[PDB]
């Protein structure tokens, strides 16, 4: 297993993703979450928004409830309740977790991962309403969504050129393999499985 695993929040579900991340953390696995602003939650926007606004006013009285606005912090709070926090084991587990909006460096130049069982599209029935989380964060007080999108747009650029270069390299490698075919070594490898 990789020393650190980066999980793409795009098209994912907050609940299942948080549960699996917490379970892995308790097992002693380092995990990082990126593109958290694109995470999704089941149900329509109104239901999710009300469930969060009511939380902000449930009182402990500022010592307890905090009107935390960052969507990454909201996800951390969601995962916080799934871990045995306020203890050495639970607190140490949370130390192996980081959440960043978008994909800041150096995670950009590294292969991200997705959880097949935490995909919003995979587990959510088609045709049913869902919440993009970004709108909820913007409505509840978050104001960095515009800047997040603006600096993520540059992320798609440059990365596209890198993908094009890798595509050309793979084209050359495939051509070399195709012309390399029919060789004695290749024939022996094919016979012996490989």
């Amino acid at each position: 297993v990789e020393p650190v695993v980066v999980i793409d929040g795009k098209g994912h579900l907050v609940g299942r993703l948080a549960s699996v991340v917490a379970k892995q953390l308790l097992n002693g696995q380092k995990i990082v979450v990126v593109r958290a602003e694109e995470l999704n939650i089941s149900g329509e926007f109104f239901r999710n928004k009300l469930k969060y606004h009511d939380f902000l006013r449930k009182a402990t009285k500022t010592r307890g409830p905090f009107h935390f606005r960052a969507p990454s912090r909201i996800f951390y709070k969601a995962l916080r309740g799934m871990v045995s926090h306020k203890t050495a084991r639970g607190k140490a587990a949370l130390e192996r977790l980081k959440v960043f909006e978008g994909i800041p460096p150096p995670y950009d130049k590294k292969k991200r991962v997705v959880v097949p069982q935490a995909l919003r599209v995979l587990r959510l029935k088609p045709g049913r309403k869902y919440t993009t989380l970004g709108k909820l964060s913007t409505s509840v007080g978050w104001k960095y969504e515009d800047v997040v999108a603006k600096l993520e747009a540059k992320r798609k650029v440059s990365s596209a050129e890198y993908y094009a270069k890798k595509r050309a390299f793979t084209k050359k490698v495939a051509s070399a393999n195709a012309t390399a075919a029919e060789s004695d070594v290749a024939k022996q490898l094919a016979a012996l499985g490989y």
Partner: protein, 333 residues
């Protein structure tokens, strides 16, 4: 009591921290988004009310106006900022090669005891072909989004025993941040006048620390919708050179400004009073946007200006008034 203006804990410095700027106009020519100065006493001014439908419409009306002791703003550097998901961040700071003694004093409390090793080796880096101090401009151009000029006030011109300089950042109105940094660099060590930014009838806002009653008072406050009535130039003479009262005198009250504020530099007249008392540094801003109301758009003239001293109740306007009625004054003549 106001809920917004609580708690009443005192401000941490005499200078009021500005934390808002008039957006960023990408089409306007390069200009300063705010101005810095010092607050003097207060005076009285009368003008014609061109406001239509007013009870005193088309009639002379007296209005209370304060005077801000404005020293020339000399540029010492510029600061660039880049947008980030963690909020605005200052990526790099640069200075105008040379720094005056007043600016260096800002970093020192025991300046006399200290060996005076203020900005010096930094100037040595500038004392060459440039290299790093020139590549900083390119770095700012490449990534910066909003650029704030760094300037200080000519404290030694102000009649203040404290010769320590006061400096603050000012955003640049003009877009094309390349032009922002180019203009800032060209204006290094240059002197900027009030006319280069503000203008007559402009609805500026004032921010400063409130008076301390000796905890009530001594807290930062922002006052908006204040109209300038006349750009003042105290460096010259005959500041009262209005269209009326052709007996030119000086805005300085008899015997000087009460308590403090003997004007010896540029000044500005602003409608109403300003938070804080004299000796307090006050920053001026264009008030985000200009209201279209007549009270904010109409232009006003000026006439009578009170010059009697306030070291008591006030009576004599000029020293030449003392004659005729007093007869003989052997003690003097």
């Amino acid at each position: 009591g106001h809920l917004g203006f609580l708690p009443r804990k005192r401000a941490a410095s005499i200078r009021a921290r500005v934390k808002a700027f008039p957006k960023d106009d990408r089409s306007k020519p390069v200009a300063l988004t705010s101005f810095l100065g010092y607050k003097a006493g207060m005076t009285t001014i009368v003008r014609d009310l061109d406001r239509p439908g007013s009870k005193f419409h088309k009639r002379e009306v007296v209005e209370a106006v304060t005077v801000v002791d404005t020293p020339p703003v000399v540029v010492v550097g510029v600061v660039g900022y880049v947008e980030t998901p963690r909020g605005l961040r200052s990526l790099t700071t640069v200075w105008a090669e040379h720094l005056s003694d007043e600016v260096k004093r800002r970093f020192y409390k025991n300046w006399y005891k200290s060996k005076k090793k203020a900005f010096t080796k930094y100037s040595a880096k500038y004392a060459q072909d440039g290299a790093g101090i020139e590549r900083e401009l390119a770095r700012i151009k490449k990534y910066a989004s909003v650029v704030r000029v760094l300037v200080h006030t000519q404290i030694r011109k102000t009649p203040l025993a404290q010769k320590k300089a006061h400096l603050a950042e000012i955003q640049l109105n003009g877009g094309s941040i390349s032009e922002k940094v180019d203009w800032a660099r060209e204006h290094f060590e240059k002197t900027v006048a009030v006319d280069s930014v503000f203008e007559q009838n402009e609805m500026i806002d004032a921010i400063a620390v409130t008076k301390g009653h000796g905890q009530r008072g001594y807290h930062s406050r922002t006052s908006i919708n204040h109209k300038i009535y006349r750009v003042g130039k105290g460096d010259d003479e005959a500041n009262g050179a209005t269209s009326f009262d052709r007996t030119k005198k000086t805005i300085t009250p008899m015997g000087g400004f009460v308590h403090y504020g003997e004007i010896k530099n540029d000044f500005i007249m602003v409608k109403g009073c300003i938070p804080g008392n004299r000796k307090r540094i006050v920053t001026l801003r264009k008030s985000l946007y200009t209201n279209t109301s007549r009270k904010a758009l109409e232009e006003v003239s000026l006439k009578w200006i009170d010059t009697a001293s306030k070291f008591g109740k006030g009576r004599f306007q000029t020293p030449a008034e003392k004659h005729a009625f007093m007869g003989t004054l052997k003690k003097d003549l």
